[PDB]
Amino acid sequence: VKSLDSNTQKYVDMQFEDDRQSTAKNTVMYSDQTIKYGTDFVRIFKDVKKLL
Amino acid sequence: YYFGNIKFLGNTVYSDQQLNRYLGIKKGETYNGVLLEKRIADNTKPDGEDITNLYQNNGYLFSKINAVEVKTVNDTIDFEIRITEGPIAYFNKIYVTGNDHVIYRELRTKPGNKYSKEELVRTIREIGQLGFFDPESIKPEFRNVDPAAGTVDIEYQLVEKGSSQVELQGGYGGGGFIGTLGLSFNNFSAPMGDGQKVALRLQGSTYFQTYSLSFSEPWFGGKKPVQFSSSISYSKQFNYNYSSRDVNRNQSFNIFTVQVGLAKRLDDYFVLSQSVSYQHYDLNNYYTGLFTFGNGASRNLAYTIGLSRSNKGVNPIFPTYGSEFSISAKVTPPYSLFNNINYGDLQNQKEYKTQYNPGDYTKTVSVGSDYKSADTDVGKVDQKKYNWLEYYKVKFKADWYTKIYGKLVLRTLTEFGFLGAYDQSRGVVPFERFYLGGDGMANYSMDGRETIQLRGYPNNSLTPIIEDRNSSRYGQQIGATIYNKFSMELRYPITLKSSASIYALTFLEAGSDLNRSAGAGLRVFMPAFGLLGIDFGYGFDALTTNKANGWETHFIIGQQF
Numbered sequence: 001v002k003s004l005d006s007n008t009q010k011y012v013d014m015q016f017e018d019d020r021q022s023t024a025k026n027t028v029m030y031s032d033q034t035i036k037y038g039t040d041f042v043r044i045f046k047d048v049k050k051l052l
Numbered sequence: 053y054y055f056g057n058i059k060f061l062g063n064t065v066y067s068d069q070q071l072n073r074y075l076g077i078k079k080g081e082t083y084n085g086v087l088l089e090k091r092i093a094d095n096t097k098p099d100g101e102d103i104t105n106l107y108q109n110n111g112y113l114f115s116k117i118n119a120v121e122v123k124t125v126n127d128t129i130d131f132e133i134r135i136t137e138g139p140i141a142y143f144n145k146i147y148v149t150g151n152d153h154v155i156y157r158e159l160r161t162k163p164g165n166k167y168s169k170e171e172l173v174r175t176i177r178e179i180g181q182l183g184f185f186d187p188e189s190i191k192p193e194f195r196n197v198d199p200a201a202g203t204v205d206i207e208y209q210l211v212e213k214g215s216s217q218v219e220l221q222g223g224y225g226g227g228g229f230i231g232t233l234g235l236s237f238n239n240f241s242a243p244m245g246d247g248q249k250v251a252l253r254l255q256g257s258t259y260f261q262t263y264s265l266s267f268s269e270p271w272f273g274g275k276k277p278v279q280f281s282s283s284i285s286y287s288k289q290f291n292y293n294y295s296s297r298d299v300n301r302n303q304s305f306n307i308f309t310v311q312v313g314l315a316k317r318l319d320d321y322f323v324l325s326q327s328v329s330y331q332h333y334d335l336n337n338y339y340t341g342l343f344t345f346g347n348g349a350s351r352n353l354a355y356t357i358g359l360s361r362s363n364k365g366v367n368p369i370f371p372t373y374g375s376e377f378s379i380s381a382k383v384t385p386p387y388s389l390f391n392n393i394n395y396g397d398l399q400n401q402k403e404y405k406t407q408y409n410p411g412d413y414t415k416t417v418s419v420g421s422d423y424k425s426a427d428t429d430v431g432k433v434d435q436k437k438y439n440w441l442e443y444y445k446v447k448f449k450a451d452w453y454t455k456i457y458g459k460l461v462l463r464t465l466t467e468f469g470f471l472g473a474y475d476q477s478r479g480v481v482p483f484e485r486f487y488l489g490g491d492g493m494a495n496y497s498m499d500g501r502e503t504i505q506l507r508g509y510p511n512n513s514l515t516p517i518i519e520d521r522n523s524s525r526y527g528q529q530i531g532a533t534i535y536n537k538f539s540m541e542l543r544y545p546i547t548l549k550s551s552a553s554i555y556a557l558t559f560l561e562a563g564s565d566l567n568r569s570a571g572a573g574l575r576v577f578m579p580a581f582g583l584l585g586i587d588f589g590y591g592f593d594a595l596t597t598n599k600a601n602g603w604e605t606h607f608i609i610g611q612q613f
Contacts (some may be wrong), residue, residue, distance in 0.1 A: 001113060001194055002104065004172065009171050011098070012180030012549035013579045015368045018162070023277045023380035026315035028325040028380055029284070030498050033232050033253035033264045034221060037369075038610040039514045039582040041220035043053070047580060049442035 053083045056128040063135040065112065071336045074103060083129055083234060092117055092133075094387060097549075098173065103354070107137070109540035111167035114199055115388060116140030131566070142165035150210040154247045161206060179210070182247075183238050186211045214359035215239040220364055222584070223610035225493035227511045228299050230257045240267070247271065259292035259299050279315040287498050291340050294490070296510035302339055307498050308332040309549065313356075321363050327356040331498070333483070341518075343484040343532045345435040352441040352483070356382040369553045369577045370545055371453045382445040382484075389473035398436065399428035440612065445471045456542075465539035467504070474532065486532030488563055489514035491606045494613060502539060506561055508569030508589025510605055537563040545577050553577040559589070566594040582609050 004011075032043070060068050075091055094100030094490045105114035115137045123130045143163050148155050158178050160171040172192050191209035198204075219234040236251035248269045249302040255261070264285035272278035290301035313327035331352040341344040365371030388395070396470050398404055403428045405413055411417050415427035448468045456462050473480050484500030490512055492505020506514065516532055518525045538561070545555040554576045561569045571589030585608045591601040 003194065004169075004176075004533075005098070006136070006191075006193055007188050008176050008180070009188045010550045011176040012187045012190070014099075014173075014177065014421065016174060016366060017362065017368055018175065018230060018362055020176075020317070020320060021277055022144060022158075022198040023229040023279050024315035024317045024323050024325075026279055026281055026313045026325045027323070027360055028327045028329065029313045030285070030309060030311055031218065031255070031262070031283060031330065031495050032266055032283070033234065033255040033262055033285075034219075035223035035232060035582075035585040038221040038223040040580055041222070042218060043580045049181065 053124075054128050055079060055081050055083055055131075057570075058133065059131065060133050060135065063137065065107075065137055071106075074101070083200060088119065092119065098169070105169065107135075109169050110143045112137050112139075113141045113167055113204065114584070138199060141204045142202060144196070144203045144205055146206050146208075148208040148210060150208075151212070154182075155179065155208075155272070157274075167204060175208075179208070183217055183295065184215050184323060186213045189373045194335070215244070217254055222610055223612070225491050225496075226294055226613045227491065228258045230255065230496060232256075248509065255496065257496070258397075259565060260287060262287040262496075262498065277317060278314075280312045281311075281315075283309070283311045285309045285311075285498060289497060290497060291338065294487075303337050303346075305336060305338055305499075306332075306334040308334070309498055319361075321361050321532070323360045323362070325356075325358040325360070326355075329354045329356065333499070341525070341528050343434075344430040345438065346431070347553055348431075348435040348439075348481070350438050350441055352384070354382055354384050354441075354511040367548065367553065369583070370384060370461070370543070370548060371463075371507065372455055374453055376451040378447070378449040380445075381449040382443075384442055384444070386442075386460045386474045387440055388478055391435050395437065395475060398433050400424065404429055404432050414518040420605060423603065437478055438481060441481050442473055442475070442482060443471055443485060444474065445469075459545060461543045463539075463541045463543065465537070465541075467535075467537045469502075470533065482535050483533065485533060486535040487512050487515045487529070488532060488535055488537075491608050492612045494611075501531075504535060504563065506537065506567070506605055507559060507573070507587045508591035509559070509595065509601055510573050510604065513595045513601075514563065514567060516557075535564060536566070537561065538566075551578060559587075571594075583611060584609055 055077060058077055060071050060077065063071060066362050070209065077088070077091065091105040092102060094102040103117050115135060116133055120132055120134060121129060122132055143161055146159060146161055146163055160175045176190045176192065179185060179190050187211065190212055193207050193209055194204060195207055196203070196205040215552045217236045217238060219236065222229065222231040224230065224485065234251055234253040234256040238247060238249050239245060240248040240250045247591045248271050250435055253264045262285055264283055265284045266281065270277065271281040281395045287307045289305055289307065291300045311327055311329040315325045317323050325407060333349060333350040333352070335346055337346050358378065361377045364374040364376055371436060389488055402423045405423065406429050408414055410419060417427050419425040422592040427578055446469070450466045452464045454462050469486055471480065471484060478604065485503065486502055489506045489509045490503065493503040495502060503512065512529065516528045517527055520526065537557065541557050541559045543555050543557045547554045556574050558572045569589050569591045571587055573585060573587030575583065575585040576585045587606045588603065590603050593600060595601055
C-alpha cells in the first residue's frame with residue numbers, strides 16, 4: 001500500500017478552512033492579543049535549530 | 053521518437069474519456085518518460101493531479117497503474133496503461149497510540165467512512181495544530197488490511213512533546229510595528245487533561261500596551277464544538293496621530309476589560325457568536341478630539357451578537373470559490389428610558405455651570421450669582437452624559453469570490469457600518485467609532501476603534517475632522533459613525549505549495565459619493581515569516597486645491613483586516 005511520507009510537517013503546514021466539527025471561532029469578541037498569520041519567531045528558532 | 057495511441061485497459065470505475073482528459077497527453081508529441089511518470093503519479097507532492105491519487109482519494113487504495121510498452125515502429129511508441137482497481141476501502145477501527153477523548157474528538161477518519169487520503173491529511177494537520185505532539189512524526193500506519201473483506205485499520209503513531217507553549221509574534225499596520233509575547237498552557241482541566249487553553253499574553257505597539265489572561269474551552273459540554281472564551285485584560289493607550297506617527301505621552305487612557313463569549317455552529321455553514329463585555333475607561337488628560345472629560349472615567353457594558361456564513365475555497369490564503377457573510381449587532385442597555393433625568397436641560401442647572409468673589413459664576417469675568425448665566429461647563433455635562441456608554445452598533449460584511457478565466461480569481465468585498473444612540477439628546481458616544489483609510493488594522497486596540505483598509509491613502513487620513521475653524525481643535529480627528537466600502541480585486545497565483553503561497557493582485561476601492569483608489573500589489577505567505585504584502589496605490593481624490601492625493605505605498609505583515 002502506498003503510505004504517507006515519513007515526514008508530516010508539510011501536511012501540518014498546509015492550510016484549510018473550518019469543517020463541521022472544529023471549534024467555532026468567535027467574531028464578536030475583542031482581540032485575543034494575537035497577530036493571525038503573523039511572523040512566528042518560535043518557528044524560526046525551531047527551524048534554525050533544525051538546520052544545525 | 054513520438055508517442056502514439058495511449059489506451060486505457062480494464063478500468064470500470066472511470067470511463068476511458070475522463071482518464072484521458074486527466075492524462076493530458078496527445079498523439080504526435082515528443083516522448084518524455086519523465087513527463088509520463090509525473091502525470092501517472094507525481095510522488096513529489098501529496099496534492100498533485102495524478103492518476104494514482106485520483107483513484108486513492110475515493111478509496112480504491114489497491115489500485116495500481118503500470119505502463120507496458122507494446123510496439124515501437126515508425127519512430128513511434130505505443131502503450132497500454134493497465135489499471136487493477138480492487139474493492140473499496142472502509143475504515144473499521146481507528147485508534148491512537150503513543151499519547152484520550154481529546155484526540156478522538158478531533159478525528160476526521162471516522163469508522164465506517166469511505167477511505168479518503170484528504171481525511172488522513174486533515175487529521176494529521178489538526179492533531180499537529182493541537183500542539184502537544186511532534187509535528188514531524190504524526191504517522192498514520194495501516195494495520196489489519198484485509199483486501200478480502202475490503203477493510204482497513206489506522207493507527208496514529210505520535211510522540212509527546214509537552215502541552216505548554218511559548219509564542220513571539222509580530223506584524224505591521226497603521227505605519228507601526230506590533231508584537232505579542234504569549235505563554236499558553238494548552239491543558240488546564242479543573243493540570244493535565246481536557247483541551248481547555250489558558251494563555252497569558254502581552255501585546256505592544258508604539259502607542260498601546262495590552263496585558264491579558266484568556267481562557268478558552270473548545271468543546272463546551274464535550275459533545276459539540278461550542279467555544280466558550282473568557283478574557284481579563286488591561287490596556288494603556290496613548291493619543292496617537294496616525295498621519296504623522298508621533299505620540300503624546302501625557303494623554304493616555306487605561307481600559308480594563310472583562311469579556312465572556314460563546315461561539316456555536318448552527319443550515320450548517322453558519323456560526324452564531326455572542327459576547328458580554330465590561331470595559332472601564334480611566335482617562336488621563338485626554339483633551340483630544342470630541343473629548344472634554346479628560347480627567348473622568350467611563351463604563352461600557354455591551355452585549356454583542358453575530359451571524360456568519362463561510363464556505364470559502366480550500367486555501368484560506370487563496371480562496372477560489374465561495375462566499376462569506378457577516379452581520380453583527382452590539383447593544384448596550386437603554387439607561388436613557390429608565391433614568392428620569394433630562395439631557396436637554398442639563399446645561400441650565402446649577403450643578404453644571406462654571407464656578408470659581410469665591411463661589412461666583414463666570415462667563416473670565418465675574419457675572420454674579422445669576423444661575424442662568426456663565427458658561428455651560430462642557431466637561432461636566434459630557435461626563436454626566438457618558439458615565440455609562442450608550443450606543444447601538446451594526447456591521448455588515450460580504451466577501452464573494454469567483455473564478456473568471458484561467459487561474460485568475462476575482463474577489464468582491466462590501467461593508468456597511470453604523471453606530472448611534474438611543475436618545476438623540478444623549479449624543480453619539482465618542483468611543484467605538486469607525487476610522488477609515490490606510491494600511492488597515494484589526495481590533496488590536498480594545499477601545500472599539502476599527503481601522504478600515506483603503507489602500508492608496510495615508511493611515512487614518514479620511515476620518516472626519518473638526519471643521520469649526522475657531523474651535524481651537526481644527527485638524528484633530530473625531531471619528532465616523534457611518535461608513536461604507538466597496539472593494540474589487542483580481543488575483544493571480546504563482547505558487548500554492550504548503551511552504552509558500554505567492555500571488556499578485558490589482559485592486560479598485562471606493563470608501564466613505566466616495567473616495568476612490570486604484571493600485572497593484574504582491575503578497576507572499578509562509579508559515580514561518582507570515583503574510584508579507586506590498587501594495588502601491590494611487591488615489592484619484594484629495595484627502596484647498598482639488599488635486600488628487602496621488603501615489604502612496606504600504607507594507608503589511610499579517611492579516612490586517
